[PDB]
Structure formats: C-alpha cells, structure tokens
Amino acid sequence: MASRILLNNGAKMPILGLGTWKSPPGQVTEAVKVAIDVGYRHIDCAHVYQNENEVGVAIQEKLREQVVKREELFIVSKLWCTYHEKGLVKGACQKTLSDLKLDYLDLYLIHWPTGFKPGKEFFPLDESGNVVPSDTNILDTWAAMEELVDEGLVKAIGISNFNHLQVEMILNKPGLKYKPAVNQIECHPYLTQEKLIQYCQSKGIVVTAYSPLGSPDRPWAKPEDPSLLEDPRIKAIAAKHNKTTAQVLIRFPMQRNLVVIPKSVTPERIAENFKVFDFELSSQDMTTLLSYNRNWRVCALLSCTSHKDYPFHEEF
Ligand SMILES: NC(=O)C1=CN([C@@H]2O[C@H](COP(=O)(O)OP(=O)(O)OC[C@H]3O[C@@H](n4cnc5c(N)ncnc54)[C@H](OP(=O)(O)O)[C@@H]3O)[C@@H](O)[C@H]2O)C=CC1
Ligand SMILES: O=C(O)Cn1cc(Cc2nc3c(F)c(F)cc(F)c3s2)c2cccnc21
Numbered sequence: 001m002a003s004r005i006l007l008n009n010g011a012k013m014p015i016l017g018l019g020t021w022k023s024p025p026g027q028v029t030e031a032v033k034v035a036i037d038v039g040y041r042h043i044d045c046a047h048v049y050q051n052e053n054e055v056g057v058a059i060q061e062k063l064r065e066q067v068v069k070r071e072e073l074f075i076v077s078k079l080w081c082t083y084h085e086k087g088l089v090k091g092a093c094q095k096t097l098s099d100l101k102l103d104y105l106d107l108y109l110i111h112w113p114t115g116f117k118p119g120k121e122f123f124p125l126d127e128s129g130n131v132v133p134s135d136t137n138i139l140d141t142w143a144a145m146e147e148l149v150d151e152g153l154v155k156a157i158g159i160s161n162f163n164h165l166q167v168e169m170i171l172n173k174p175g176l177k178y179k180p181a182v183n184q185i186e187c188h189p190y191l192t193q194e195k196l197i198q199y200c201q202s203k204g205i206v207v208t209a210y211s212p213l214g215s216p217d218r219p220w221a222k223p224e225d226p227s228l229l230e231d232p233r234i235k236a237i238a239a240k241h242n243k244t245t246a247q248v249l250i251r252f253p254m255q256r257n258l259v260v261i262p263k264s265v266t267p268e269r270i271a272e273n274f275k276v277f278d279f280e281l282s283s284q285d286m287t288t289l290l291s292y293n294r295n296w297r298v299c300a301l302l303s304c305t306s307h308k309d310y311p312f313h314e315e316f
Contacts, residue, residue, distance in 0.1 A: 019263030
C-alpha cells in the first residue's frame with residue numbers, strides 16, 4: 001500500500017510511527033536517531049511522557065546531519081488533562097514546542113477527554129483516590145485547540161480516547177471551524193474496536209492504533225495477563241508468512257487503513273518493526289485476527305471512572 005494516509009487538512013501522515021511512552025530519557029535519543037536512519041518519519045510524543053526534551057535532541061541532530069528535512073517529518077504531541085482550561089492550552093503547546101525544539105507540530109491531540117484540576121500534579125487525587133476533575137468541557141477545549149491552528153503553532157488537531165458520543169459532540173459543535181483529523185485509540189487483536197473505527201472512518205477521521213503489541217511493558221502488567229506476542233494462534237500466522245509475531249501485529253492495523261505506532265527502544269526491534277511493507281495478510285488471516293477480540297483494555301485507570309467524561313462506560 002501507500003506509506004502515507006491523507007488527512008482532512010490535506011497533509012499526508014506516515015502510516016507507521018514510533019511510540020515514546022515509557023521510553024527512558026537516557027535511551028530515547030538513541031531510539032529516535034536509529035528510527036530516523038532506518039526510515040521512520042512519524043514520532044508519537046506527549047508532555048506527560050517526560051521525555052520530549054530528549055526526543056527533540058534526536059530530531060535536531062538528524063536535521064543538522066541532513067539525514068532528513070523538517071517537511072519530511074511528522075511530529076505528534078498531546079495536550080495533557082491538567083491543561084484543558086481555555087487559557088492554558090497555548091502555554092502547554094508552547095512548552096512542548098520548546099522541548100521538541102520545533103516551531104510547529106504536524107498534529108496536536110487532546111490526550112484524553114477528561115479535564116483534571118490544574119496544577120503541578122499530572123493526576124491530582126482527592127483524599128480517597130478519585131481524580132479531581134476540572135469544570136471544563138470538551139467543546140471549550142476544542143475551541144482553544146482551533147486557535148493553535150490559526151496561530152500557526154500546529155498544522156492539524158485531533159483527539160485521543162474519545163468514544164463515539166464524544167466525537168459526535170465535537171462534530172455537532174456550534175461554530176466548528178476545524179474537524180478532528182485523527183482519533184488515536186487503543187487497538188489490537190484483543191480489543192478490535194470495529195464499531196468505533198467504522199464510525200470514525202465514516203466521518204472522515206483517521207484512526208491511529210496505540211498499544212498495537214498489547215503494551216507488555218505497561219507498569220500495571222500482571223504475570224497472569226494475556227500476551228499477544230506469545231499467543232500461539234498469532235505465532236502460527238506469523239510462521240506461515242516467515243515474519244515475526246510483532247510484524248504481524250503491526251501489519252494487521254495497516255490493512256484496516258489505520259495508522260500504527262509501536263514503541264521500542266531496542267535498535268534491532270526498531271528496524272524489525274519497520275520491515276512490514278513487503279508482505280500482506282490474506283482476507284482470511286484478517287477475519288481470523290478480528291475473531292480474537294475479547295474487549296480486553298490495557299489503558300484505563302480506576303481512579304478516573306467517576307469523571308463525567310470518562311470515555312469507557314459507553315459501548316463504543
Ligand atoms: N493516546 C494515548 O492515550 C496512548 C498512546 N500511546 C502511544 O502508543 C505507543 C505504543 O503503545 P505502548 O503502550 O507503548 O506499547 P506497544 O504495544 O507498542 O508495546 C511496547 C512493548 O513492546 C516491546 N516491543 C516492541 N517491538 C517488539 C518486537 N519487535 N518484539 C518484541 N517486543 C517488542 C517493547 O520493548 P522495548 O521497548 O524494550 O524494545 C515494549 O516493551 C506508545 O509508546 C505511545 O506513543 C500508548 C498508550 C496510550
Ligand atoms: O496516556 C498515555 O498516553 C499513557 N498512559 C495511559 C494511562 C492509563 C490512563 N487511563 C486514563 C483514563 F481512563 C482516563 F479517563 C483519563 C486518563 F488521563 C487516563 S491515563 C497512564 C497512566 C499513567 C501514565 N501514563 C499513562
């Protein structure tokens with residue numbers, strides 16, 4: 001297939017990117033350098049990952065070395081939950097631009113639909129461990145994001161972890177100026193998201209699949225948890241194609257016309273994960289992989305389940 005997908009702002013987004021959540025600051029600079037050398041052109045970042053400065057060091061080194069030009073890169077970051085207030089959005093974006101050492105972002109996402117109390121804590125909790133919400137709503141935050149496009153700080157804006165009703169609220173916003181370009185959501189064979197993906201695609205919103213390998217390094221992983229990389233049924237599909245299970249898991253969302261952002265800090269896996277343009281999964285393979293759905297969600301937090309905008313009470 002084509003290596004880039006067209007967004008509604010007319011820009012082309014590479015369908016394979018590098019994830020950076022949990023990538024330690026002491027290893028992420030090398031990871032991004034190696035990724036750019038072997039062909040990656042899309043990096044997924046966030047302020048909350050606490051490593052944007054070091055990601056920026058890698059990008060600057062490869063620009064200075066003339067391995068790539070800025071126009072060829074697609075850099076994504078996300079507005080954290082403590083900055084949903086209208087007057088905090090520009091400042092949060094500027095801090096990210098400063099750390100990444102860039103003068104614009106290709107895409108900036110609302111990280112989660114839930115606004116939290118502003119302050120220095122990323123997850124402000126009350127005395128009994130509930131997240132403290134802010135009185136912001138999704139629509140006012142969206143208007144502040146639209147301002148960033150008009151001021152030239154970002155080329156495209158989008159959302160992440162929004163359910164279909166929350167997407168709908170934005171699409172029906174009075175005075176909507178820029179539609180969301182992308183909805184970035186958890187997606188893998190144990191959480192296939194057919195309903196939400198169909199909804200988004202029908203509205204012309206591109207879907208990015210996160211945790212495509214099932215996030216085995218997530219901090220709350222338990223030893224008894226399901227493992228996609230070790231699923232013998234997926235191993236057999238990989239073996240039939242002479243590819244690794246990770247390569248099958250990355251190729252899967254690509255054939256559903258999704259963008260996919262696997263994370264690695266290991267140079268040999270960074271290279272392996274990019275070698276996914278030289279094979280195809282059959283229609284039969286795809287239907288079989290879809291059959292493995294178990295509505296098993298890796299990214300959710302119990303402390304957030306009372307927030308009015310918690311996205312995962314709805315079916316999709
Ligand atoms: N918007 C949002 O709310 C969210 C966005 N994301 C984004 O999605 C990205 C990917 O999701 P993430 O949850 O990090 O996890 P992934 O599903 O990408 O899995 C990452 C794990 O897989 C390992 N791995 C990578 N490649 C291979 C391979 N070829 N063989 C064996 N193991 C491999 C990595 O190890 P190692 O690094 O040691 O090589 C790491 O432990 C995130 O980094 C982030 O950018 C993720 C969660 C939420
Ligand atoms: O958000 C990311 O990209 C990575 N990431 C995901 C999680 C799990 C979360 N679940 C929810 C959630 F269910 C919410 F409603 C709001 C949130 F901000 C989070 S964050 C996490 C926790 C702690 C640190 N990072 C996390």
